[PDB]
Amino acid sequence: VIGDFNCTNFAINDLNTTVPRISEYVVDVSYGLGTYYILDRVYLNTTILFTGYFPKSGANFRDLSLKGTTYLSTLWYQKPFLSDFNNGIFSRVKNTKLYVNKTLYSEFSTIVIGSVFINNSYTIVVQPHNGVLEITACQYTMCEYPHTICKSKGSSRNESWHFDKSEPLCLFKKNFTYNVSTDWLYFHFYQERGTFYAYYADSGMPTTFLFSLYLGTLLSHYYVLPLTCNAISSNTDNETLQYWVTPLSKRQYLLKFDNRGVITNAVD
Ligand SMILES: *[C@@H]1O[C@H](CO)[C@@H](O[C@@H]2O[C@H](CO)[C@@H](O[C@@H]3O[C@H](CO[C@H]4O[C@H](CO)[C@@H](O)[C@H](O)[C@@H]4O)[C@@H](O)[C@H](O[C@H]4O[C@H](CO)[C@@H](O)[C@H](O)[C@@H]4O)[C@@H]3O)[C@H](O)[C@H]2NC(C)=O)[C@H](O)[C@H]1NC(C)=O
Ligand SMILES: *[C@@H]1O[C@H](CO)[C@@H](O[C@@H]2O[C@H](CO)[C@@H](O)[C@H](O)[C@H]2NC(C)=O)[C@H](O)[C@H]1NC(C)=O
Ligand SMILES: *[C@@H]1O[C@H](CO)[C@@H](O[C@@H]2O[C@H](CO)[C@@H](O)[C@H](O)[C@H]2NC(C)=O)[C@H](O)[C@H]1NC(C)=O
Ligand SMILES: *[C@@H]1O[C@H](CO)[C@@H](O)[C@H](O)[C@H]1NC(C)=O
Ligand SMILES: *[C@@H]1O[C@H](CO)[C@@H](O)[C@H](O)[C@H]1NC(C)=O
Ligand SMILES: *[C@@H]1O[C@H](CO)[C@@H](O)[C@H](O)[C@H]1NC(C)=O
Ligand SMILES: *[C@@H]1O[C@H](CO)[C@@H](O)[C@H](O)[C@H]1NC(C)=O
């Protein structure tokens, strides 16, 4: 289970549907993908040695996305899917693009980052809403079996990942835009000296600072929520979710900046 709140007993089973698939693709930082722009700094026309929270060059990713129809498996809410956060993660996220009539809708898995996922502790939630990325850190009463839905093509489930009827205490709450036409989003989520840091991109480039938040407490776990949908399968659209993850470590990189201050190259 994720949290301890019994939000539902509708269509729960114990089926071993899948395990996290390993990417044929590997971390290749040679053009700055898997790096980030350093906070609010600009570096121009120079090479920097920077020790940051970076993925290991040549590492694989695990796809942690789960697509459901009606049933949720209890085995989805355990290791290997419920994961130790350690220093942090680099995410490569497929923007799943669905069409209703001719209109584009953007879907991808919500990620939650926390410790025990009980409402006496802060859970960071990063959730798409069709070109809006809602980010919160809010003492959520997380469900035992949390999931999101396709709002575009619908689900046989109501959306359910927390049960807070009154608004819970928030440390952070902000919305960021992203380009709904993209193929990939990239994220860094890491922690240092009790502060959480988030970065994102939506084009295959070094990530840009979203926010940072002082927690003091270590984040110990993360979990990519299942998404339940009547679409996103071979019998309906041949579309897929993908939420690829690889661990960060405290690591020295060479970063090369051009005269525009763009990271054109990096070395692990
Ligand atoms: C922060 O997060 C916590 C933890 O998730 C929330 O606390 C839980 O809140 C729910 C909802 O109120 C609690 O569920 C209710 O528990 C009552 C007490 O349980 C009795 O029975 C058990 C049987 O094992 C005994 O262990 C216990 O001692 C009691 O004798 C029930 O009376 C309630 O019954 C209602 O719901 C059930 C279905 O669940 C129906 O069958 C009943 O007819 C009735 O409608 C209910 O089950 C839960 O116990 C709390 N957990 C803990 C650990 O305290 C907080 O609410 C949340 N805080 C905020 C501010 O959001
Ligand atoms: C989780 O909550 C559900 C919904 O309240 C519980 O289901 C009820 O269980 C009682 C006792 O068996 C039944 O009389 C009700 O008819 C059930 N309602 C529904 C809608 O199914 C469920 O038992 C709870 N499970 C746990 C592990 O707490
Ligand atoms: C951030 O984005 C979300 C998603 O668009 C906003 O949530 C909506 O807010 C309105 C007004 O409160 C509600 O009527 C909708 O039902 C909400 N939608 C969802 C999916 O929850 C949210 O208000 C935005 N703003 C901030 C500051 O978080
Ligand atoms: C699920 O099935 C795979 C393939 O047989 C196996 O490797 C894995 O250990 C199983 N997991 C569980 C929780 O049974
Ligand atoms: C960039 O740096 C190189 C090496 O120092 C230098 O030759 C070049 O003139 C610089 N260009 C600009 C636009 O500053
Ligand atoms: C959005 O993404 C698509 C595909 O990567 C790209 O062609 C387009 O130029 C992008 N538009 C904006 C405003 O970023
Ligand atoms: C999905 O792809 C398979 C293999 O190409 C094909 O048999 C099936 O008809 C396709 N279905 C849809 C809805 O595209």
CATH fold node name:
Jelly Rolls
Cα Rg: 18 Å
Please name the CATH architecture. Sandwich
Order of helices and strands: EEEEEEEEEEEEEEEEEEEEEEE
Give a count of the beta strands, DSSP E runs of length 2 or more: 23
Quote the distance from N terminus to C terminus. 36 Å
Structural class: mainly beta
The coarse silhouette is globular
- The percent range for helix content is under 10%
Structurally, how many domains make up the residues?
A: 1
Largest sheet: 9 strands, antiparallel
Tally of DSSP helical segments: 0
Taken as a percent bin, the fraction of beta residues is over 45%
Bound molecules: a molecule of 5 linked components (NAG-NAG-BMA-MAN-MAN), a molecule of 2 linked components (NAG-NAG), 2-acetamido-2-deoxy-beta-D-glucopyranose
Q: Tell me which oligomeric state these chains represent.
A: monomer
Q: Please give the CATH class.
A: Mainly Beta
In CATH, the homologous superfamily goes by the name Spike glycoprotein, N-terminal domain
